[PDB]
Amino acid sequence: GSLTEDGLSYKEKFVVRSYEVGSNKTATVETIANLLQEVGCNHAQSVGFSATTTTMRKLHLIWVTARMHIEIYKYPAWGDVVEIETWCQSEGRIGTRRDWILKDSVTGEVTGRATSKWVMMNQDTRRLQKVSDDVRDEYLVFCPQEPRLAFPEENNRSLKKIPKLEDPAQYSMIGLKPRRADLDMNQHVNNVTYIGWVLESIPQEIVDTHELQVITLDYRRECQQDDVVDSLTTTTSNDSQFLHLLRLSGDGQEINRGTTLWRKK
């Protein structure tokens, strides 16, 4: 990959691998999510972040994902070359936003697009705080100055409020644990693993007859190495809609909530 001409976005090419495809001989949303985070990491390194600044490292401050929204038109096939462009922007003191565009390399057409909100947090106390000038002024030089939105539409489906699923849930998958391969280098559960967990309680009937178009996922609380998660899903509707909740299998503490949209194969 490489920074674009104007040094305000980053592009990278990927060849979809045999182990990255699912039931439809096409790439899973989890794989696509992995490619989002990889190109995110390449961009952060390209401009010298490591995604903390020296100011952030001094104050033990980290970015964490508050929300993730992914929309896929076409899942790329094994051996297909996909191009992903990414950029991130200030939302002032609220936090940053990273956005992605996925293209078919050969035809040049948009096959998916994604957006995510990141909030600034104390590493140790786990306490969210508004973004200060010093921090903003260090990263604003690496962001397009004009607004550039992957989801421009004046009311798109990335910024709607996700309600809490109510017991009893229609579908459930019980006793979900992360394994050591689900842990980043810092022993924090990978963000893409929550996506797997949410989809675990989607019914087989739907996997068989429908394909996933849109997923929106709120991050409330991280799941630790020795936590257990229950995955809850209820229908809310050609198209199929589902309300989702991850919560700790014991006391039922919420870690994630979300929505998915499925179109008929």
Next chain:
Amino acid sequence: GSLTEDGLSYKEKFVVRSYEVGSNKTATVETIANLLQEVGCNHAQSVGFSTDGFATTTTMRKLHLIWVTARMHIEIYKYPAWGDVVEIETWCQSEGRIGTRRDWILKDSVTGEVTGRATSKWVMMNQDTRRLQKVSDDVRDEYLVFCPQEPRLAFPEENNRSLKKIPKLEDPAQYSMIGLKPRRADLDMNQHVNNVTYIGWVLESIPQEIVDTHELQVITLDYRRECQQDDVVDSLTTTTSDSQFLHLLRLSGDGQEINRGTTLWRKK
């Protein structure tokens, strides 16, 4: 990647990715194992064989016959760091009518040094029946033209590590992790649990203090029976000693064996 000059092996380069690295900012053996399968698929496609993981030929598909991993053996000297470029060469080789063998060599692309090597034994099996059967001469004729004719061995040494007999762990196990289920991302396009997930499950019951002080050098895994989508696994480990462990996977219920293995760990 590409078939080498003589069309009897296949070479491919990988750039190690952020999500591919573990606790020591280096690639997991699960990622390595993934890249081994990837280059194996790329080789099988480049010479016209099946891309299903089963690597079927013409006189195999109609007899409903598939290749199945009986055994896998991996040794890593160095684990590639994030952004490091790694080159993997793979080839296939006939083992009489007992089955086929696939080997790999890992190199650091920059220094050309060997940093890992692997070998695996495949057996032919009728899908629907889960049988076995030795290989026929009619099948061999159309896959021996794609193998080096003279023997070529990742682990050439006569009576080496990859060919020792692994015994059944006896209750009680020293370490256990129980109630392990596969998720949908653990299943290939055929809807079978991908054989790299077993590697993951075996290491789940490695003590944490060993993860903190040692690095994994060797793993050897026997594949007895496939775990279904709706099966549950317990992972059992016992120290046999450098640290050595004996491993067992078995259905959480009736304790039906699915895998046995050994791992060798070196001090960091």
